[PDB]
Design a protein around this ligand. Structure first.
Ligand SMILES: O=C(O)c1cccc(C(=O)O)n1
Ligand SMILES: O=C(O)c1cccc(C(=O)O)n1
Ligand SMILES: O=C(O)c1cccc(C(=O)O)n1
Ligand SMILES: O=C(O)c1cccc(C(=O)O)n1
Ligand SMILES: O=C(O)c1cccc(C(=O)O)n1
Ligand SMILES: O=C(O)c1cccc(C(=O)O)n1
Ligand SMILES: O=C(O)c1cccc(C(=O)O)n1
Ligand SMILES: O=C(O)c1cccc(C(=O)O)n1
Ligand SMILES: O=C(O)c1cccc(C(=O)O)n1
Ligand SMILES: O=C(O)c1cccc(C(=O)O)n1
Ligand SMILES: O=C(O)c1cccc(C(=O)O)n1
Ligand SMILES: O=C(O)c1cccc(C(=O)O)n1
Ligand SMILES: O=C(O)c1cccc(C(=O)O)n1
Ligand SMILES: [Cl-]
Ligand SMILES: [Eu+2]
Ligand SMILES: [Eu+2]
Ligand SMILES: [Eu+2]
Ligand SMILES: [Eu+2]
Ligand SMILES: [Eu+2]
Length: 129
């Protein structure tokens, strides 16, 4: 599924991301925008053989187990396939662990390079939350 930005904002708010760890809702919507282009089924293989999965491009070296990334730490204790769901719950559960693991939202490189420090509230403009 490809989410609308407001559709996703509302779902993210329902799953507790409005100011989670001090990151306003617009930060989370913007992260999804530039990580996955709002696509719940996005996948991208990395040079190290790991793959980034889903709406928040959660990677199989550190966060989820895809069975094909030798040495996966699987810090969210979940199959990566769960993170490709049309429903964002498992991805949000895991994102809350990622964001609190040492580097804040800097874990999301696309967020760092396109979202961090910008007027991220613009990403939730007009939305019914
Ligand atoms: O994500 C959405 O649902 C969305 C995004 C922009 C505009 C609208 C709208 O006007 O409905 N809805
Ligand atoms: O694509 C959309 O965002 C959309 C389409 C129809 C109605 C609505 C709405 O009521 O938000 N939103
Ligand atoms: O009964 C429900 O399904 C319900 C209640 C509040 C919000 C929402 C929602 O926004 O999906 N859904
Ligand atoms: O994703 C959802 O939970 C959803 C989608 C459309 C309408 C509603 C609702 O009215 O609860 N909830
Ligand atoms: O938590 C929710 O929003 C929820 C749960 C079950 C069904 C629905 C629905 O059909 O909207 N919504
Ligand atoms: O968890 C954090 O450290 C955090 C959260 C939001 C913004 C910032 C910041 O500007 O440093 N830091
Ligand atoms: O697997 C990793 O992420 C890793 C391994 C060695 C060094 C570093 C590092 O310094 O980030 N990171
Ligand atoms: O994305 C990463 O490289 C990452 C994630 C968690 C821990 C570490 C690390 O300890 O290097 N590195
Ligand atoms: O190659 C890596 O493991 C790497 C690269 C940039 C940042 C980090 C990190 O924060 O762990 N790790
Ligand atoms: O771009 C906007 O300012 C906007 C878009 C959709 C709805 C609304 C609104 O209901 O205020 N505002
Ligand atoms: O969230 C919104 O709907 C919004 C935000 C900024 C400006 C406007 C506007 O000028 O209508 N609307
Ligand atoms: O407060 C607002 O965001 C607002 C108020 C009136 C109209 C609109 C609009 O048409 O977008 N937006
Ligand atoms: O499914 C949708 O189109 C949707 C869901 C929540 C908010 C909005 C919105 O603000 O447009 N649109
Ligand atoms: Cl915001
Ligand atoms: Eu809409
Ligand atoms: Eu519902
Ligand atoms: Eu590292
Ligand atoms: Eu900080
Ligand atoms: Eu308006």
């Amino acid at each position: 599924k490809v989410f609308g930005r407001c559709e996703l904002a509302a779902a993210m708010k329902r799953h507790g991301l409005d100011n989670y760890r001090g990151y306003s809702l617009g930060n989370w919507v913007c992260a999804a925008k530039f990580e996955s282009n709002f696509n719940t089924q996005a996948t991208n293989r990395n040079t190290d053989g790991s793959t980034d999965y889903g709406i928040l491009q959660i990677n199989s070296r550190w966060w989820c187990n895809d069975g094909r990334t030798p040495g996966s730490r699987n810090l969210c204790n979940i199959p990566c396939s769960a993170l490709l769901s049309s429903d964002i719950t498992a991805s949000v559960n895991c994102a809350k662990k990622i964001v609190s693991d040492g580097n804040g939202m800097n874990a999301w490189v696309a967020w760092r390079n396109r979202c961090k420090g910008t007027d991220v509230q613009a990403w939730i403009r007009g939305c019914r939350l």
